[PDB]
mmCIF file of C-alpha atoms in Angstrom:
data_model
loop_
_atom_site.group_PDB
_atom_site.id
_atom_site.type_symbol
_atom_site.label_atom_id
_atom_site.label_comp_id
_atom_site.label_asym_id
_atom_site.label_seq_id
_atom_site.Cartn_x
_atom_site.Cartn_y
_atom_site.Cartn_z
ATOM 1 C CA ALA A 921 24.806 26.062 28.329
ATOM 2 C CA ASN A 922 28.201 23.812 27.026
ATOM 3 C CA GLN A 923 27.061 21.428 29.805
ATOM 4 C CA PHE A 924 23.221 21.457 29.422
ATOM 5 C CA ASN A 925 23.550 20.539 26.229
ATOM 6 C CA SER A 926 25.336 17.858 26.021
ATOM 7 C CA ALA A 927 23.702 16.091 29.915
ATOM 8 C CA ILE A 928 19.708 16.023 27.263
ATOM 9 C CA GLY A 929 22.764 14.424 24.306
ATOM 10 C CA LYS A 930 23.387 11.403 26.642
ATOM 11 C CA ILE A 931 19.739 11.225 27.681
ATOM 12 C CA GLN A 932 19.515 11.053 24.151
ATOM 13 C CA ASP A 933 22.061 8.589 23.737
ATOM 14 C CA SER A 934 21.468 6.648 27.130
ATOM 15 C CA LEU A 935 17.600 5.691 26.418
ATOM 16 C CA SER A 936 18.570 5.232 21.849
ATOM 17 C CA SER A 937 21.345 2.601 23.513
ATOM 18 C CA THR A 938 19.741 1.337 26.773
ATOM 19 C CA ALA A 939 16.331 0.548 26.377
ATOM 20 C CA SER A 940 16.471 -1.432 30.167
ATOM 21 C CA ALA A 941 16.116 1.832 31.946
ATOM 22 C CA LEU A 942 12.153 1.941 31.279
ATOM 23 C CA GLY A 943 11.679 -1.363 32.787
ATOM 24 C CA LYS A 944 9.961 0.229 35.992
ATOM 25 C CA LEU A 945 7.379 0.601 33.172
ATOM 26 C CA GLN A 946 7.836 -2.575 31.546
ATOM 27 C CA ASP A 947 7.413 -4.352 34.476
ATOM 28 C CA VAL A 948 3.659 -2.733 34.611
ATOM 29 C CA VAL A 949 3.213 -4.442 31.294
ATOM 30 C CA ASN A 950 4.359 -7.786 32.283
ATOM 31 C CA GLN A 951 2.673 -7.501 35.449
ATOM 32 C CA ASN A 952 -0.214 -7.346 33.770
ATOM 33 C CA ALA A 953 0.356 -9.633 31.081
ATOM 34 C CA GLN A 954 0.983 -12.305 34.115
ATOM 35 C CA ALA A 955 -1.933 -11.517 35.276
ATOM 36 C CA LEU A 956 -4.036 -11.615 32.587
ATOM 37 C CA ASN A 957 -2.580 -14.634 30.530
ATOM 38 C CA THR A 958 -2.995 -16.176 34.148
ATOM 39 C CA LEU A 959 -6.378 -15.860 34.578
ATOM 40 C CA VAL A 960 -7.718 -17.159 30.953
ATOM 41 C CA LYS A 961 -5.196 -20.324 31.696
ATOM 42 C CA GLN A 962 -7.643 -20.851 34.357
ATOM 43 C CA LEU A 963 -10.095 -22.150 32.628
ATOM 44 C CA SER A 964 -8.149 -25.105 30.509
ATOM 45 C CA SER A 965 -7.487 -26.349 34.372
ATOM 46 C CA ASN A 966 -10.048 -28.954 35.926
ATOM 47 C CA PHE A 967 -10.089 -27.807 38.971
ATOM 48 C CA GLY A 968 -10.654 -31.544 40.706
ATOM 49 C CA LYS B 534 -21.669 -13.855 10.795
ATOM 50 C CA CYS B 535 -22.109 -14.961 14.131
ATOM 51 C CA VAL B 536 -22.760 -18.826 14.711
ATOM 52 C CA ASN B 537 -22.505 -21.709 16.468
ATOM 53 C CA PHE B 538 -18.781 -23.190 14.785
ATOM 54 C CA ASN B 539 -18.684 -27.083 14.908
ATOM 55 C CA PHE B 540 -16.380 -29.252 12.776
ATOM 56 C CA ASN B 541 -15.199 -32.386 13.896
ATOM 57 C CA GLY B 542 -12.929 -31.529 16.213
ATOM 58 C CA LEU B 543 -15.067 -28.642 18.789
ATOM 59 C CA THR B 544 -18.556 -27.215 19.792
ATOM 60 C CA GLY B 545 -17.820 -23.085 19.819
ATOM 61 C CA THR B 546 -19.584 -19.504 18.903
ATOM 62 C CA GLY B 547 -17.970 -16.551 16.791
ATOM 63 C CA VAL B 548 -17.743 -15.651 13.048
ATOM 64 C CA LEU B 549 -16.066 -16.759 10.900
ATOM 65 C CA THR B 550 -13.425 -15.094 8.608
ATOM 66 C CA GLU B 551 -11.914 -16.448 5.604
ATOM 67 C CA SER B 552 -7.825 -15.532 6.211
ATOM 68 C CA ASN B 553 -4.665 -16.351 4.551
ATOM 69 C CA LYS B 554 -2.795 -18.086 7.160
ATOM 70 C CA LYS B 555 -1.107 -21.644 5.636
ATOM 71 C CA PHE B 556 -1.348 -25.343 7.703
ATOM 72 C CA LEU B 557 0.505 -27.335 6.986
ATOM 73 C CA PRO B 558 -1.572 -30.730 5.436
ATOM 74 C CA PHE B 559 -1.268 -33.206 8.715
ATOM 75 C CA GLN B 560 -2.609 -29.282 10.671
ATOM 76 C CA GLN B 561 -6.448 -29.468 11.655
ATOM 77 C CA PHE B 562 -6.587 -26.733 14.293
ATOM 78 C CA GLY B 563 -4.528 -24.060 15.221
ATOM 79 C CA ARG B 564 -4.592 -21.762 18.881
ATOM 80 C CA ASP B 565 -3.022 -18.539 20.168
ATOM 81 C CA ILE B 566 -0.553 -17.997 23.390
ATOM 82 C CA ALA B 567 -3.576 -18.188 25.180
ATOM 83 C CA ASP B 568 -3.975 -21.954 24.024
ATOM 84 C CA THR B 569 -7.433 -20.460 22.937
ATOM 85 C CA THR B 570 -8.215 -21.904 19.681
ATOM 86 C CA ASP B 571 -8.262 -18.584 16.369
ATOM 87 C CA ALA B 572 -8.649 -20.818 13.573
ATOM 88 C CA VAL B 573 -9.818 -23.589 12.025
ATOM 89 C CA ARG B 574 -9.756 -25.810 8.598
ATOM 90 C CA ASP B 575 -12.402 -27.025 6.872
ATOM 91 C CA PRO B 576 -12.711 -30.931 7.175
ATOM 92 C CA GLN B 577 -14.899 -31.260 3.596
ATOM 93 C CA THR B 578 -13.374 -29.257 1.404
ATOM 94 C CA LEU B 579 -10.259 -26.917 2.096
ATOM 95 C CA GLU B 580 -10.365 -23.541 3.629
ATOM 96 C CA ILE B 581 -8.397 -21.862 6.698
#
């Protein structure tokens, strides 16, 4: 009981102190952001 | 309302709504992170 309850508390402290553990999902948002922004910015290019 | 708007610098079609944004006296229009114009100032009177 003291091992599990303390382990869950460490997860809550790890997620609050370290925000880079979720970067796996943040990359999906970043890949979408870079893809959506690039497709819009190509409208300004002259393409010759 | 949906209208075709041209103030002195560009052509475009959209809905114009006055906002609380503040432009510098020498700043004509402005663009977003996508390099598309989201705002324009009245060339005649002072409106944003």
